Amino acid sequence: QMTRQARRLYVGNIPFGITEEAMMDFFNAQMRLGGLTQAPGNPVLAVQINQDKNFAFLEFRSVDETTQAMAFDGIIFQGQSLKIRRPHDYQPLPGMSENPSVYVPGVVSTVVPDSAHKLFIGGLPNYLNDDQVKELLTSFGPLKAFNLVKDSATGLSKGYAFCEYVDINVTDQAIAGLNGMQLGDKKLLVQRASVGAK
Ligand code: NA
Ligand code: NA
């Protein structure tokens, strides 16, 4: 019921062509290797893929492993940052908090909250994947959050992104270092996202 929705997650921005088996094997292996499972065996029970909108719902064997799984928001799978979110009709169970107790080194969250230091990157070649765009930005250091915007129709980048660095103080060096860089046949725009936000 309510309990089943506390055992499901939306997984968006899934790569083209992924089977249910590959998604399951990836999550099961990574959760166990990552130490996120709380009992022996595989934590994922089921996977339902919608290839038309590039998302899956994952179903887990337990409520607490579902919550821990949210620490994989932004994990890279075949070059793409998976977006992990609660079901819209999730309601937390009494005596449970809805966010995880664990941080997985190297996972960069896809949630980029509005802030003084959040950046907008525009002008990206739209054939560069999430990891390839992250590798660009991380020439100024580790990212704290990042999302590349995709076109729900080409299965493809709309050519702009948002991010936030771990180090506050690199923000101006990043704009300075990237604003206007030529990239194949296009020049980069980089600025604080508050500047062109509708
Ligand atoms: Na709990
Ligand atoms: Na546009």
Residue numbers in the entry: 143 to 340
Paper text:
By sequential boot strapping, we optimized the oligonucleotide length, the position of a Br-dU, and the identity of the terminal nucleotide (rU, dU and rC) to achieve full views of U2AF651,2L bound to contiguous Py tracts at up to 1.5 Å resolution. An extended conformation of the U2AF65 inter-RRM linker traverses across the α-helical surface of RRM1 and the central β-strands of RRM2 and is well defined in the electron density. Surprisingly, the RRM2 extension/inter-RRM linker contribute new central nucleotide-binding sites near the RRM1/RRM2 junction and the RRM1 extension recognizes the 3′-terminal nucleotide. There, a salt bridge between the K340 side chain and nucleotide phosphate, as well as G338-base stacking and a hydrogen bond between the backbone amide of G338 and the rU3-O4, secure the RRM2 extension.
A tightly controlled assembly among U2AF65, the pre-mRNA, and partner proteins sequentially identifies the 3′ splice site and promotes association of the spliceosome, which ultimately accomplishes the task of splicing. Initially U2AF65 recognizes the Py-tract splice site signal. To investigate the structural basis for cognate U2AF65 recognition of a contiguous Py tract, we determined four crystal structures of U2AF651,2L bound to Py-tract oligonucleotides.
